[PDB]
């Protein structure tokens, strides 16, 4: 271990998206991923144990040779920007939009896949893939919040999943950590893409108006 | 499309009639069936946008 460990730049980004504090109410299986209660009810997620689970999840994706057998899901629409651009980086075959129950089971279906791993985003907003994961013997990484329980989840990353910048940060440092195990760019070297792609875009009340203000 | 016949059969129980209708499919030419296409079945063309931009 000890050489992939966190630095002051990493926790500068994590504390910027607001993913250190979670929901008011938890899964009971979320016992080990909490540091202290707080006023407002909000729960201080400890960050070394997020990084423990980000350490495994990068080890999970790289473990298979063929990267094109990774299916990545988002049903709710904060990470449908993220999944389509996370997959644009590494090897994943993105299923954004609606899930179409029976994507894995019936062999009479056309748009029909058989991956070796699944990456979902919000386990309460994605109950159908986690149910379908138990039919074709495939493991599942999930970006779990506190109130999200853990049925057919394997690699839970404690975070917030209701925010916009909160979700997309995890996708950024995952793929960066995934590529770091593929052998691309050092720890002791900076990175080239900047996470505002992966995070989210709102309706462009700001985005075209920030481009209209930057005229 | 639907050619149809009825015939008689005299059996060891009594009599039987048989009905066989067969929908002749459409090829646009052939002794397979009628040359008129299926009125529900509307098929389309292919795209040809492979090359060129202003020179």
């Amino acid at each position: 271990l000890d050489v992939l460990q966190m630095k002051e730049e990493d926790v500068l980004k994590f504390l910027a998206a607001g993913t250190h504090l979670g929901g008011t109410n938890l899964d009971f299986q979320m016992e080990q991923y909490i540091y202290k209660r707080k006023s407002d009810g909000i729960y201080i997620i400890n960050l070394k144990r997020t990084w423990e689970k980000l350490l495994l999840a990068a080890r999970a994706i790289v473990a298979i040779e063929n990267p094109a057998d990774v299916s990545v899901i988002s049903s709710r629409n904060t990470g449908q920007r993220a999944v389509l651009k996370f997959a644009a980086a590494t090897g994943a075959t993105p299923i954004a939009g609606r899930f179409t129950p029976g994507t894995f089971t019936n062999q009479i279906q056309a748009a029909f896949r058989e991956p070796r791993l699944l990456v979902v985003t919000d386990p309460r907003a994605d109950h159908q893939p986690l149910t379908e994961a138990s039919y074709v013997n495939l493991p599942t990484i999930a970006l779990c919040n506190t109130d999200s329980p853990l049925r057919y989840v394997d690699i839970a990353i404690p975070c917030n999943n209701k925010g916009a910048h909160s979700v997309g940060l995890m996708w950024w440092m995952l793929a960066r950590e995934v590529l770091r195990m593929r052998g691309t760019i050092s720890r002791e070297h900076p990175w080239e893409v900047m996470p505002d792609l992966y995070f989210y875009r709102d309706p462009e009340e700001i985005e075209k108006e920030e481009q209209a203000a930057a005229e | 499309y639907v050619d149809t016949a009825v015939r008689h059969v005299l059996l060891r129980q009594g009599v039987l009639g048989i009905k066989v209708k067969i929908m002749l499919p459409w090829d646009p030419t052939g002794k397979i069936g009628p040359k008129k296409p299926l009125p529900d079945h509307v098929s389309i063309v292919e795209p040809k946008d492979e090359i060129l931009p202003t020179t």
Binding site: L1, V3, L4, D27, Q29, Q32, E52, K53, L55, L56, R59, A60, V62, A63, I64, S134, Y135, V136, N137, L138, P139, P149, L150, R151, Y152, V153, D154, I155, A156, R180, M181, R182, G183, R187 | -
Partner: protein, 81 residues
């Protein structure tokens, strides 16, 4: 199972689970074969080897697997000291 003649008749060894030590059956289609990669020394580069985890169904349903993976990585000693 071997007899007094030491005879291998027995068909296969089914994948016994990691946490439960329970047998995964043939038609138990909610089993899992998890595989987490090795990393190197100081370089932090991919060793071309790995360690294999197999979990059974009733662990997988009840949420118990998530305690089982990281503690087995701790039983490996690959996630904490």
């Amino acid at each position: 199972m071997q007899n007094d003649a030491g005879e291998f008749v027995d068909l296969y060894v089914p994948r016994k689970c990691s946490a439960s030590n329970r047998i995964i059956g043939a038609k138990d289609h909610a089993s899992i074969q998890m595989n987490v990669a090795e990393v190197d020394k100081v370089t932090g580069r991919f060793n071309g080897q790995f360690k294999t985890y197999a979990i059974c169904g009733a662990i997988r349903r009840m949420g118990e697997s998530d305690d089982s993976i990281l503690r087995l990585a701790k039983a490996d000693g690959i996630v904490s000291k």
